[PDB]
Amino acid sequence: GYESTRPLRYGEASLGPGQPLFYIDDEEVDFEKVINAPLPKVPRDMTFTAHWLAVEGVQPSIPQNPTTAEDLLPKG
Amino acid sequence: LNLIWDNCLKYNQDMNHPLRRMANGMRKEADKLIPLIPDITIRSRAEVEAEERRKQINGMALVGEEAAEQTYEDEAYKIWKQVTKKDRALIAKERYQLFANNKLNVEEPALLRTKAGMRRFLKSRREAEAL
User: Fold this and answer.
1) How far is CA B3 from CA B9, B22, B23, B26, B100, in A?
2) B118: closest CA of chain A, how far (Å)
3) Can you list the alpha helix ranges (DSSP code H) found in chain B?
4) Which residue among A20, A69, B97, B126 is least packed, with the fewest CB closer than 10 Å?
5) Which residues from chain A sit within 8 angstroms of residue B114, using beta carbons?
6) How many CA atoms lie within 13 A of B31 on its CB side?
């Protein structure tokens, strides 16, 4: 039961001053809401592309490479 | 320009000299681009104001050979040469300097790849794609 896609929320009880307690938030639901709900969106299929990461030691400035704006060169 | 044509003819009376043919082309160019200039006079403001107030050998041989060989040619080819001559000369001069005396000079700038050149190539490729 730990593979659910729903968010995890904790309540907060107060047994006394400085002695809080936490419990899992769980509200009863009707079967109509669960059965009638829509399904999540199907992601696209797996595929692969290609491009040139470097030509003769220099990185081309193409959309597929990172921008020069944003550790790659010794300075000793 | 008129006397330039006469002076060139007079000094070298040899008609068949390609130099006069060059002058003939230069004369043709003069006729082509002359009309742009209006016949304006440099009138000093005082003169205009005063008027208003009153109112108020081998190289030469090769050049000649090419000039004769120009009889068969194409205008677009000449335009291409005119466009690309400066860059071609620069690149050729650099290349000639690199391999002086058929020896790899160890002082000329090294041949390296740069990002700006590839950016220029990408711009040209996009221009080609637009076609």
Assistant:
1) 10, 15, 11, 13, 46
2) 7
3) 2-11, 18-33, 45-55, 58-69, 75-98, 115-130
4) A69
5) 58
6) 8
Give the C-alpha separation, B55 to B47, whole Å. 12
Type of residue at B75: E
Q: Which two tokens stand for residue B20?
A: 């006069």
Q: Are A39 and B94 in contact (CB under 8 A)?
A: no
Distance between B122 CA and the closest CA of chain A, angstroms: 8
- For residue A17, what is the DSSP state? T
Q: Show which residues on chain A lie within 8 Å of chain B, measured between beta carbons.
A: 55-62
| Structure's resolution in angstroms | 3.5
Are B114 and A61 inside 8 Å of each other by CB?
no
For A68, phi and psi rounded to 5 degrees? Answer: -60, -20
